[PDB]
Design a protein around this ligand. Sequence first.
Ligand code: HEM
Ligand SMILES: *[C@@H]1O[C@H](CO)[C@@H](O[C@@H]2O[C@H](CO)[C@@H](O)[C@H](O)[C@H]2NC(C)=O)[C@H](O)[C@H]1NC(C)=O
Ligand code: NAG
Ligand code: NAG
Ligand code: NAG
Ligand code: CA
Ligand code: CL
Length: 595
Amino acid sequence: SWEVGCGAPVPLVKCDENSPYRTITGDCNNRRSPALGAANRALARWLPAEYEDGLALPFGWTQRKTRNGFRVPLAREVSNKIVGYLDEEGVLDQNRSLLFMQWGQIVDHDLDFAPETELGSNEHSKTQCEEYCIQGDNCFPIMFPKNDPKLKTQGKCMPFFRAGFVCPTPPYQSLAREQINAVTSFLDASLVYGSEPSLASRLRNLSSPLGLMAVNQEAWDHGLAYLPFNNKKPSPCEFINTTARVPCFLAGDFRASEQILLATAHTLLLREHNRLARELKKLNPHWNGEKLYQEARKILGAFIQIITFRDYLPIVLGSEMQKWIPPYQGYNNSVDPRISNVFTFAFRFGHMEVPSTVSRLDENYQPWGPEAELPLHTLFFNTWRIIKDGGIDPLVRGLLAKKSKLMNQDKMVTSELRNKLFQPTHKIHGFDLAAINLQRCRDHGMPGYNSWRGFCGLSQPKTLKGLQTVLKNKILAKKLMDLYKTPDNIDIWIGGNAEPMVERGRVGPLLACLLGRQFQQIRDGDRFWWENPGVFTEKQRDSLQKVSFSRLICDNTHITKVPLHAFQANNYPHDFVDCSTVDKLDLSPWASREN
Ligand code: HEM
Ligand SMILES: *[C@@H]1O[C@H](CO)[C@@H](O[C@@H]2O[C@H](CO)[C@@H](O)[C@H](O)[C@H]2NC(C)=O)[C@H](O)[C@H]1NC(C)=O
Ligand SMILES: *[C@@H]1O[C@H](CO)[C@@H](O)[C@H](O)[C@H]1NC(C)=O
Ligand SMILES: *[C@@H]1O[C@H](CO)[C@@H](O)[C@H](O)[C@H]1NC(C)=O
Ligand SMILES: *[C@@H]1O[C@H](CO)[C@@H](O)[C@H](O)[C@H]1NC(C)=O
Ligand SMILES: [Ca+2]
Ligand SMILES: [Cl-]
């Protein structure tokens, strides 16, 4: 008999019995509970939060407060001892293209964003944390251990600001702190169109009644569109080359410029909307602007959903795919479609799949120019390498011909991310995404590794010998026991990712359960799922059946040689075919021949 959810932010709640189109915010998707899966609401709690104080303080905040009678190891020490490796040789995935890593980050970006609290935008609050490393309020610095090389070149800490939470921005009464999902839980292309009405209108071309998305006016890719620039400072994309002065891009999601291949993928998606808008005009010259936007938006939403669930999830989950995601049996309005706090950590498995280098290939799939291959760390917030060095085609070839990094228990996160991560505001290519992932776990009050094994109906090792058996690795198990003293204390991010990969998949059994459940819930609980009776026509649905990533590239770049199966390892010229031969999306069924 406890009171039900403080939602003082987001009072707006007006819904519509007609609507054949998703809202931008994802409101009104669920008729009975219409805020479920909407942006700027709490992440769902599959299990109760676990803070040191039971409310808000993360484990590792107070020196003398143990977790189950043991101090928690520093994020950065766990990073250094477990996550790091030197040798990039033999680390590549012989059966996953780099497009595999890249699609993951896109889907993640559609589903969840828990952005850091905004009580320090052009304030001397950010600097307190950076310079002086002093813990307090929303500053929760990543302190270096004794023998850390970063001590010698970077100071005592790496800065870290706690994530936004609902009813902000000082804590409340006697409910655990709940972090905001700032995008739509629905796989709805929010990353392209935005999750706020504000950003959604900005991105749109409201000059012509063609329902087009705004494209770059300052620069073109052999006639093909770039995303608009984000004319705001400080721009991190300007910071990394003040001679190029190429701003970050403006997309439906904030993080589109974080690295050059995400920006690339955002560019294909935008172009595809525009191509769809133009072809719907041809076939329906009567349709006004809004109609064209919405009818293109909804097709691209289907596209993202089909590629994710037909092509991507099966080669993530492998043998566990059908245990968790059986054939669609239609909309179930009883399902919770909200993204869970734990999913936003479970989906970070993607971090082990990022390789140390990126390549540009010519029309013969050969090194484009003399610096064709670049270290990943020089491509954080790097847009000028696209604008002033060959557009997205050389990079979209590298996404086809190059391989993802394979998860390895001995080689977890490349030093490009683990030591050389660039963050906006901060000046240096010197951060640790592994350490960030671990502090964030604690920041979100995540239950430990065994709570989540429990949740998924899996054994809970309590001994070294127990952990060895589960991880199938005596040395990794040893290092974790030395750090965490009990498997109960292991942060789910590292515990989940340390498990050996399921047959035909790229995650362990724990992550397969957590990912599997979340993707089942976003499908079965989405009123606007593409294959859900009444959303498309029977004829339209047969047209959608035919989409491929290959087609997406043929239609939206100057590439003519692609593989049939974009996510497998594919070598040129053998596994490559003429676009001429690749199933089109026939849009005839969108023609409103009748009235
Ligand atoms: C070069 C590639 C990538 C970079 C530079 C990158 C960087 C980042 C950064 C900086 C964060 C925020 C960390 C924090 O404040 O807690 C993050 C979060 C995340 N990343 Fe990545 N990432 C990359 C690739 C991927 C991939 C391939 C996936 C999945 C397949 C992925 C999934 C996630 C998820 C799920 C989150 C949490 C998002 C949220 O709800 O806030 N990332 N990434
Ligand atoms: C900043 O960007 C500029 C280009 O905008 C880079 O310089 C092209 O770079 C190389 C020379 O190193 C040549 O291929 C071109 O002739 C350059 N053009 C110009 C106008 O310089 C420069 O290297 C970048 N700097 C960094 C630190 O990345
Ligand atoms: C590669 O993965 C595919 C699924 O993408 C699978 O059907 C096949 O067994 C694998 N091929 C090789 C060469 O191992
Ligand atoms: C809007 O569309 C018109 C017609 O295609 C075009 O001329 C104009 O540049 C577009 N504006 C933007 C900002 O994309
Ligand atoms: C709908 O969802 C609930 C809870 O997930 C489940 O118990 C119920 O049986 C479902 N019904 C169908 C037809 O899937
Ligand atoms: Ca979404
Ligand atoms: Cl290189």
